[PDB]
Amino acid sequence: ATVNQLVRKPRARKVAKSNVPALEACPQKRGVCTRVYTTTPKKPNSALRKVCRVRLTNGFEVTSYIGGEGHNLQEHSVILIRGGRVKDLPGVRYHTVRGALDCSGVKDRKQARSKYGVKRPKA
Template sequence: MPTINQLIRNPRVALTVKSKSPALENSPQKRGVCTRVYTTTPKKPNSALRKVAKVRLTNGFEVISYIGGEGHNLQEHSVV
């Protein structure tokens, strides 16, 4: 337990919050261009073929995003 003088000399430092999705830059969505559309399998213990796309965002980041719903018409160079 620090003394009052110690707290005056060296105040408590708040923890910095690290973003879980830095590529979005605090935006709800971002626009980008599909660079690859493919299926992948999830981690254990789940099993399926998940439809995903590698997307190059307008800010330069490249992210893997999930394609929801039944069926899609996305292909390479699609703007999403």
Template sequence: VARVRLTNSIEVTAYIPGIGHNLQEHSVVLIRGGRVKDLPGVRYHIIRGTLDAAGVQNRLQGRSKYGAKRPKK
């Protein structure tokens, strides 16, 4: 999870989907709605593969949800 300050200066908690991430303290991210059932207060998801959030490495199935490119043959 990550604490994210929105452009309207509200601070929210957002979930980072997938295994591992490259986000650091001042990374700029795009978020979408959608809560995480087993984490109280987490109502947003970070969209992988946009802005500073890189896609998940070695992801072969469900790639579009994790910003993973199609692997080379």
């Protein structure tokens, strides 16, 4: 790695392969679920993971975790998706937004409702 080697070959740098390819820098994308399904983990861990196969406007079909506590989705349900990766899910790099575009407004939540679209309940 001497200078005379740099002049004959400058230092390179590998590109930043986007962990969220199906977004193409779009902060969100609209999509239609082409399948709905849940998956339990191995014998030791018992849990249910909500997730949909969804075709995007760009043409990609991906997997997006269903935020949970709102489940009104089925084949041909449009939905807006954002790039969020949950641990314990192998291919889920996207989270369905909760609170817009054909997603049920979750039942009343007194805390952190904005992250679910629940409006401030007017007592």
